[PDB]
């Protein structure tokens, strides 16, 4: 397991001393024992700078840029289709839309009415 400088890691302590517990920063230092991970932390309304070392079997290499690495390549994948066609790609990520009107049949499904009968 290799850590380099600039890797983005998250904290998952495999206790009760200190708690960040799921917080994410970047790596600046590597020695054989620990690695140097530096962390933003607000005081007042201003972010500080927390150099910090951690035993390397408590810290995981974070993947959070995963979908973004896909989606730039996905847009270019759709872009290759986009030159091959008279089409708008609609490459934007969209919010979830409110859904449609539709008819539901009570044919195989008689509405089993209920109450706190009790049961």
């Amino acid at each position: 397991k290799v850590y380099k400088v600039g890797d983005i890691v998250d904290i998952k302590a495999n206790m009760p001393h200190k708690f960040y517990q799921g917080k994410t920063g970047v790596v600046y230092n590597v020695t054989k024992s620990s690695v140097g991970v530096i962390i933003n932390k607000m005081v007042g309304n201003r972010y500080l700078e927390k150099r910090l070392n951690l035993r390397v079997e408590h810290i995981k290499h974070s993947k959070c840029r995963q979908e973004f690495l896909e989606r730039v390549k996905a847009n270019a994948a759709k872009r290759a289709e986009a030159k091959a066609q008279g089409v708008a790609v609609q490459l934007k990520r969209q919010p979830a839309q409110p859904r449609e009107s539709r008819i539901v049949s009570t044919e195989g499904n008689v509405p089993q009415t209920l109450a706190p009968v009790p049961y």
Binding site: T106, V110, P111, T113
Partner: protein, 51 residues
């Protein structure tokens, strides 16, 4: 120099919406709708009447 509200002062309503003239012509808000005899299915009646 002054905002003349529509929905009164009909001249400023006709400053907008030239269609609104014929809206009051064909009277278009007291439009009648025709009736159709479409009774619901009886299951629907039961489930409403059901306790």
């Amino acid at each position: 120099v002054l905002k003349k509200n529509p929905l009164k002062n009909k001249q400023v309503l006709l400053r907008l919406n030239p269609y609104a003239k014929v809206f009051a012509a064909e009277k278009l808000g007291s439009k009648k709708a025709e009736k159709t005899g479409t009774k619901p299915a009886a299951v629907f009646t039961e489930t409403l009447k059901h306790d």
